[PDB]
């Protein structure tokens, strides 16, 4: 207990948000002039959705462990929000991509996200920095499971622009820069753990001491080890649903692990499937041009039971990606370049320091007129 007034204080406002803002608040003037003259804080409309997103995850784990079917904050977040957020005449505020990341976000607690190109299209307003960290991490983890892996370098590079120019000034992240920037580079490095070794997107971004901490992990992938499905799965384990708090822990019947067997046990068996491609990619190309004697020379050099090994060499070569045409007369395999890219961060680091040289001069030129 001690958390039941935490929901009940804020959901009494969240009851009103479907009531006021969808039904009647297109010509509502009297609540507006209360919010201009009385209070001291101006940013409550970004407080009132996003702190309500926090407090409902605090009570989804509470209610779903006390009521399975038709939970009450499953009702007030899920069954009230979505048509009430977008559909009305123009809410000329910062809520534009904010409300769809609730609408995609409540489409994301249950795993059924299929909608990436449709919400890409519909936006006419600008982006919030709180919006930008969640939306590449949401659709990139969607593409981590929906396996657009050659564009997964593009989605997780987009989040890592890293120019903060810090704005705190009263907790405006909220609580979520350092945790989620830890998150999005980790699955990015776990992309370099799963999809070995095509990025070359964390090598030019960050230092090499952190990349060797995963570097201990990714060399376990290659020939031999059973924990490589497990280190991929357990480091994603606070990232699948992210549950925050139980209020009642009674294990006689548990009645909280039945939603855990919903997501977690069936999500783990596909992490065994993730490093299977890494066992297809367990020969990095060191010998890539062969005769037909050295394809069968590759059949016995990889493993025993060499003839017929082509029934399991095709199992060793075909998971999503592998491209070479084989000859039968002269036996020529083909060779696909692992080729270097070149330094574009010399350009970007001019733009890193030129925004910093102007802004260190921008903020502190006010200082020369604040105190002198």
């Amino acid at each position: 207990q001690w958390l039941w007034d935490i929901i009940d204080e804020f959901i009494y406002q969240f009851q009103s948000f479907s009531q006021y803002r969808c039904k009647t608040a297109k010509k509502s003037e009297e609540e507006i002039d209360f919010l201009r003259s009385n209070p001291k804080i101006w940013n409550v409309h970004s407080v009132l959705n996003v702190l309500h997103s926090l407090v409902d995850k605090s009570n989804i784990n509470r209610q779903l462990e006390v009521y399975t079917s038709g939970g009450d904050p499953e009702s007030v977040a899920g069954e009230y929000g979505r048509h009430s957020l977008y559909k009305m005449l123009g809410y000329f505020s910062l809520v534009g991509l904010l409300r769809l990341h609730s609408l995609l976000g409540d489409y994301y607690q249950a795993i059924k996200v299929l909608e990436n190109i449709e919400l890409n299209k519909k936006s006419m307003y600008s982006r919030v920095p709180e919006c930008q960290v969640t939306t590449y991490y949401y659709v990139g983890f969607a593409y981590l499971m929906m396996r657009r892996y050659q564009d997964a370098i593009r989605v997780f590079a987009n989040i890592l622009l890293y120019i903060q120019r810090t704005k705190s000034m009263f907790q405006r992240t909220t609580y979520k820069y350092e945790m989620i920037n830890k998150q999005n580079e980790q699955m990015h490095a776990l992309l370099a753990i799963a999809l070995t070794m095509y990025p070359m997107r964390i090598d030019e971004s960050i230092h090499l001491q952190l990349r060797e901490k995963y570097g201990d992990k990714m060399l376990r992938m290659q020939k031999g080890d059973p924990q490589v499905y497990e280190e991929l799965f357990s480091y994603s384990c606070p990232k699948f649903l992210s549950p925050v708090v139980p209020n009642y822990d009674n294990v006689h019947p548990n009645y909280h692990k039945e939603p855990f067997l919903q997501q977690l046990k069936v999500f783990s068996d596909e992490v065994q499937q993730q490093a299977q491609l890494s066992t297809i990619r367990s020969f990095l190309k060191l010998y890539t041009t062969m005769p037909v004697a050295k394809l069968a020379g590759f059949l016995d050099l990889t493993e025993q039971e060499f003839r017929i090994q082509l029934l399991v060499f095709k199992h060793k070569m075909k998971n999503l990606v592998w491209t070479s045409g084989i000859s039968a007369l002269d036996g020529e395999f083909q060779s696909a370049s692992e080729v270097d890219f070149y330094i574009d961060k010399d350009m970007i680091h001019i733009a890193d320091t030129k925004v910093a040289r102007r802004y260190g001069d921008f903020f502190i030129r006010q200082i020369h007129k604040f105190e002198e």
């Binding site: 048509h83 249950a110 059924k112 929906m146 657009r148 075909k318 999503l320 080729v339 350009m347 001019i350």
Partner: protein
Amino acid sequence: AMFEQMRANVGKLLKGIDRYNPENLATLERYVETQAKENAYDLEANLAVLKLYQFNPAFFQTTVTAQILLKALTNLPHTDFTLCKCMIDQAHQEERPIRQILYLGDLLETCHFQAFWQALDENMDLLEGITGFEDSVRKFICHVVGITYQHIDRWLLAEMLGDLSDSQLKVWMSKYGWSADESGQIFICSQEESIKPKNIVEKIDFDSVSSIMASSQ
């Protein structure tokens, strides 16, 4: 024929607020009946029958949920298969032949075909209960062979395509851009496409740096 009018049921009712009312399932498991008889498609509504299952376990139906993954095997090589495989809870996987059909998705990405065509337990009539499962899952398979070959003989081709003769092998290969250049080779594409250089000669253009070149000048 019957496709167009029931597409109006799923495309104009279930694109909105009704999705947390289970009275769409009285035509949606009938849409599970629709895809078995006329090879229809609505994926996000075939996900929507499974959306009702893990939020409400009181409405689990066995005969509905088996065929929708088997028809998601007809929506392989498309990678929505990974999402819908984990959409059924683990509490509904102990039953049989659900264990058998979820094991079948494991053997197709790693391309096992001796179990799929020659050791297949054909005791269930729902494989013929869906229309065109052979033409759909080989359409997955003639797609994946076109990456990996430039020369293969037609004896070893029909062995890995599950034991159909040359009387049909030339018909299916007339469909998909395959010529039989004889004894035994098969023409898919040229050499020079898939050396794939992301090459050394990548450049910096005039307009890519002129953003910074205007202020330093």
